[PDB]
Design an enzyme around this catalytic site. Structure first.
Site, PDB file in Angstrom:
ATOM      1  N   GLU A  80       0.802  -1.223   0.000  1.00 29.93           N
ATOM      2  CA  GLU A  80       0.000   0.000   0.000  1.00 29.93           C
ATOM      3  C   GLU A  80       0.835   1.275   0.000  1.00 29.93           C
ATOM      4  OE1 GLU A  80      -2.680  -0.434   3.427  1.00 29.93           O
ATOM      5  OE2 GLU A  80      -4.151  -1.111   1.939  1.00 29.93           O
ATOM      6  N   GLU A 131      -6.933  -7.438  -0.160  1.00 29.98           N
ATOM      7  CA  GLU A 131      -7.280  -7.519   1.253  1.00 29.98           C
ATOM      8  C   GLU A 131      -8.658  -6.943   1.526  1.00 29.98           C
ATOM      9  OE1 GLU A 131      -4.262  -5.670   3.665  1.00 29.98           O
ATOM     10  OE2 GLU A 131      -2.717  -6.952   2.764  1.00 29.98           O
TER      11      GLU A 131
END
Length: 604
Positions: free
Chosen positions: A161, A238
């Protein structure tokens, strides 16, 4: 050598050995599960209807000291992957270097902070060098487990991320190169980010994926991605679902409904996913992380309100998801059976026989003229005592500790004067008239290092300075005797036990029957626990967590040992083993500033 299997990024689909395949992954954290329960938890994921397990690799767990790599026992990620293979489960690896995951400094090692001006998550020469060495070690451990080598690993991640950190494609590119140079060249490499920032660091030669949580809008999440790449398979790297607690904050849970629905929308579109926390487990020892920017330490328990609870038991949520997944099975397919739970025992009241006062059991002092952080004293975890002497004074004075990182107790000649909590950003202490030579003790406990954003730059101990204010003005307090109190079980065992203030408590107890148990820490203040040498984790009277999960696999028939480091003194020096955990009991006044207590009706 073994035959070569394949996993490929196809046209609007993934291909496992040439066949379309939808990844239904379970997110698992091997450090949060006793190595003895890895198999059991893997089977629970399998009976749940998952076909893949996603594994973050925690750098600081494997290299707690620069150069000292560890991949044995609980740190044997290869063993876990093999266990996964033995159960027909595929694995997706997220090798760090940064993993976030509510874990100590997001997985990054504290010793990097020894370089004052170190720049994290970018091409800082020292940082990049350690990252390459760490990755190479991970490669030696898992490269031969790629599906392309007869193993079960189907994909490997590049960073984590980064879009929520900054914009630096050269960095991501080098990270990618190191992953490849580490040995991961037989399977696709991928990136993961948010719908609102994935374009910032997206590399053309890599698969792009999106992360988001329950309540998100599937179409709104992938809408842009489909535009840029119409033929790319879609995957929610996710899917965040559940709730993890923080010390001093009300416990919460999330409904199975919203989850099942979210999982069905993706399933009904053949969208790949990884249920962010199918089984959370426990942040054993000192590994739990903390929130940023408002410092908030996560609780030891990492139950997450996941389908598979902390002790690996079936929950109503498990059943609802297991039944859902059970439908999208191939034609003429039956879900595997649910493994039997591990039995739980209740242990009768354990009285702490021995006690060792911390101040009477200090290691050798490190002398320092000025204030320095814990890391500057070559310590990354535990507590640190800053001690000095003060000049006499007729009138009251005030002490300002500029940033006691995390939790400090201040003593004057052994008598506790105050408690400063970083949760509230406290730092001032009132000193009474002093006699020449009075002893000033500032014991600072370091809790987890923040794991998100710029929070990774989290130095512990006293970060800047200590000031004394009198009728004559303000001056810096210098000349310190610094005592580093490590978390090692070895240090906690080697104490002068005998038979208010910080102390180690000890007692042995016999067991005739084994099983999982939950230690009731309701009689205690704050600290950490060890059972037969295993670091069970931190506890704190404020809750919401009041029990500490103790795996039966760490208990033994006969004599068992328990050591408790309590910082402020227990109401009673005894604990008990319960068969059920306590995760929703809070105590004391607000641990946070009112504007963050999330409640206002008639304060004052």
């Amino acid at each position: 050598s073994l035959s070569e299997g394949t996993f490929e990024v196809g046209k609007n689909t993934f291909l496992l050995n040439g066949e379309p395949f939808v990844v239904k992954a379970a997110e698992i954290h091997y450090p949060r599960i006793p190595k003895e329960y890895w198999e059991h938890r893997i089977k629970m994921c399998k009976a749940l209807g998952m076909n893949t397990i996603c594994l973050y690799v925690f750098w600081n767990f494997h290299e707690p000291e620069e150069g000292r790599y560890d991949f044995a026992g609980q740190k044997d990620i290869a063993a876990f992957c093999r266990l996964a293979q033995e159960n027909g489960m595929y694995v997706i690896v997220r090798p760090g270097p940064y993993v976030c995951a509510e874990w100590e400094m997001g997985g990054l090692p504290w010793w990097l902070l020894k370089k004052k001006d170190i720049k994290l998550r970018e091409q800082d020469p020292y940082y990049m060098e350690r990252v390459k060495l760490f990755l190479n070690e991970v490669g030696k451990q898992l490269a031969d487990l790629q599906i392309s080598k007869g193993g079960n690993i189907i994909m490997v991640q590049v960073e984590n991320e980064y879009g929520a950190f900054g914009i630096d494609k050269p960095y991501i590119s080098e990270i990618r190169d190191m992953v490849k140079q580490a040995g991961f060249t037989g399977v696709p490499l991928f990136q993961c980010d948010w719908n609102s920032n994935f374009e910032n660091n997206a590399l053309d030669d890599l698969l792009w994926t999106i992360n988001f949580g329950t309540g998100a809008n599937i179409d709104e999440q992938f809408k842009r991605l489909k535009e840029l790449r119409p033929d790319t398979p879609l995957m929610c790297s996710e899917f965040w679902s559940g709730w993890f607690d923080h010390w001093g904050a009300k416990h919460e849970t999330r409904s199975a409904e919203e989850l099942v629905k979210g999982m069905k929308e993706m399933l009904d579109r053949n969208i790949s996913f990884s249920l962010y926390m199918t089984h959370g487990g426990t942040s054993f020892g000192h590994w739990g992380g903390a929130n940023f920017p408002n410092f908030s330490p996560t609780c030891t328990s990492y139950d997450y309100d996941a389908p598979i609870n902390e002790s690996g038991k079936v929950t109503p949520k498990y059943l609802e998801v297991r039944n859902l997944l059970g439908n999208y099975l191939p034609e003429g397919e039956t879900l595997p059976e649910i493994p039997d739970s591990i039995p739980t025992i209740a242990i009768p009241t354990i009285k702490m026989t021995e006690m060792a006062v911390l101040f009477d059991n200090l290691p050798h002092p490190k002398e320092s003229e000025d204030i320095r952080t814990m890391e500057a004293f070559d310590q990354g975890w535990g507590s640190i005592l800053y001690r000095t002497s003060l000049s006499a004074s007729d009138k009251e004075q005030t002490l300002l500790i500029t940033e006691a990182h995390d939790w400090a107790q201040v003593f004057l000649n052994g008598k506790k004067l105050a408690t400063l909590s970083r949760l509230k950003g406290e730092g001032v202490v009132k000193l009474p008239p002093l006699k020449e030579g009075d002893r000033l003790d500032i014991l600072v406990e370091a809790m987890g290092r923040m794991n998100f954003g710029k929070g990774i730059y989290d130095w512990k101990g006293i970060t800047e300075k200590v000031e004394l204010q009198s009728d004559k003005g303000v001056e810096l307090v210098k000349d310190w005797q610094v005592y580093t109190i490590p978390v090692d079980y070895s240090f906690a065992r080697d104490k002068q036990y005998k038979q208010n203030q910080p102390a180690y408590y000890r007692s042995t107890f016999n067991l005739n029957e084994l099983g999982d148990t939950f230690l009731n820490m309701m009689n205690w203040s704050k600290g950490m626990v060890w059972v037969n040498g295993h670091a069970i984790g931190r506890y704190w009277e404020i809750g919401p967590q009041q029990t500490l999960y103790v795996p039966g696999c760490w208990l033994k028939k006969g004599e068992n040992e328990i050591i408790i480091l309590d910082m402020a003194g227990p109401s009673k020096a005894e604990t008990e083993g319960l068969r059920q955990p306590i995760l929703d009991v809070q105590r004391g006044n607000g641990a946070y500033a009112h504007r963050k207590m999330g409640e206002g009706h008639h304060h004052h």
